[PDB]
Each structure stands twice: as structure tokens, then as C-alpha cells.
Paper text:
The four point mutations that allowed evolving EGFP into rsEGFP2 (T65A, Q69L, V163S, A206K)16 were thus engineered in Superfolder-[name], yielding a new PTFP that we named rsFolder. Thus, when compared to rsEGFP2, rsFolder exhibits six point mutations (S31R, N40Y, S100F, T106N, Y146F and M154T), only one of which occurs in the vicinity of the chromophore (Y146F). As rsEGFP2, rsFolder is an efficient negative photoswitcher, both in purified form and in live cells. Thus, photophysical and biochemical data suggest that rsFolder has inherited both the fast folding properties of Superfolder-[name] and the fast switching properties of rsEGFP2. Models were refined at 1.45 Å (on state) and 1.50 Å (off state) resolution for rsEGFP2, and at 1.50 Å (on state) and 2.35 Å (off state) resolution for rsFolder, respectively. In the on state, the phenolate oxygen of the cis chromophore is H-bonded to Thr204, a water molecule and His149. Upon isomerisation the interactions with the two first partners are lost, while His149 and the phenolate oxygen remain H-bonded, resulting in a trans conformation of the chromophore that is a mirror image of the cis conformation. In rsEGFP2 and rsFolder, on the contrary, no such reorganisation of H-bonding networks is observed and the structural changes are restricted to the near environment of the chromophore phenolate.
Author numbering: 1 to 65, 69 to 233
Write the structure that this text describes.
Amino acid sequence: MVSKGEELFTGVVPILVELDGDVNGHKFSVRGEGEGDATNGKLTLKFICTTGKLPVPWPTLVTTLVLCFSRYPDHMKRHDFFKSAMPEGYVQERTISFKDDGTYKTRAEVKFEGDTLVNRIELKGIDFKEDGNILGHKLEYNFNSHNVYITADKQKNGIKSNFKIRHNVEDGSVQLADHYQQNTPIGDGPVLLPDNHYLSTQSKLSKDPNEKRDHMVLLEFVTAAGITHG
């Protein structure tokens, strides 16, 4: 263990995710539950739209809806900001710019509440096109594999990332979603600020055959990489 936080992730940890959103005035909420295991990088989550029909495509919410569950290899343990901020946790903020379309702005807190790792999010979506790929639900129900580059932000005692997500569109085109991210500790205890590296992601989206509500099942693996050794 190279942070106290890391001790909270030696096994499987239950997860709760709660999102309250407003996209072009369309208000919706999501709740998810499941579990994560940073020892193998595996996340299993099922989300429900609790307000009815989700007014945006599920794949557009994957990144918003717990990088503390990334598998950091043994030689990279000292570069794991996310666990080091636990249990008090961190604020994760993004701007997600959909190319030629609207923008999501998100603020989340990721922290332990009791024994559960909780990701609680506020999302505001603006300037979407009524007949665009998002509000028009033109995006395929799938998700690509990405590298998400992590850099220290010494001024804010946290990290930052920017990355592009490529959403497949039903007409064979691609909808780009350019992510800019910042994470900052909730607490004022010490955290690990990393050397430059990246997280390798892969996600599989599916449906629960017994679930009649609008929902998404997610199976994800996230592994850290990119440090020559230490």
C-alpha cells in the first residue's frame, strides 16, 4: 500500500451512482448500482432512468456515470491519485463538447458513504440540436475502447485529462465527444500526484431481459499504463 486510500480497494466494493440531469430543459434522473474491483480493473453496473424515458442516448452518459476502480500495476501504485483521495473522495468535473452539437457540463463527487463507493452527479446539457445525433437518438448502442491520458495538476492538487470519445452513428458516421476533465480532492489530506500516464478502457453495453424500464447494463475494464517503471 502506498496510500491509505488504496487499502479500501483490496477487494470488491459495492457502488451507487446517482445522476440528476437537464438537457435542453429535459429533466431526468439515473440511478445505478453494482460493484467494482480495482485489483482486476472490472466494473459491473446496471443503471435505470428513474424518471421515465432517457432523453439522450445511454452511450453519451457512460463516461459521466469511478476511475478509482482502475487497475494500477504494481510499478504504478504511486501514480494513483484516485484511490489516494479516499475515503473523503474527489470532485470530478467535465465539459463534454459534442462536435457540431451541444455540450454537457458535469460535476460529480466520488467518495465513500458508509461502505459504498458513491458517484453523485449533476449534469447540465445545453445547445443541442433537436434533430441532432443526441436528442434525435441516432447513436448506436455500443462503446469503443479508449486511452485516457492523465496529467498532474499541481496547482489544484489533483489531475486533469482531455480525450475524445467516438460514438458510432446509425448512418455510419461518427459523433465526436471531446472531454475536458479535472479532479480535485474533497479533503485536505495528502494525495498522490502522478507522472504522465494513461488509462486503457473497454466497455460492453447490454440489456437486462427482465427489465422493462429504460436502462443500461455496463461491463467495463480499466487498466493504467504508460510508465516505464515506477
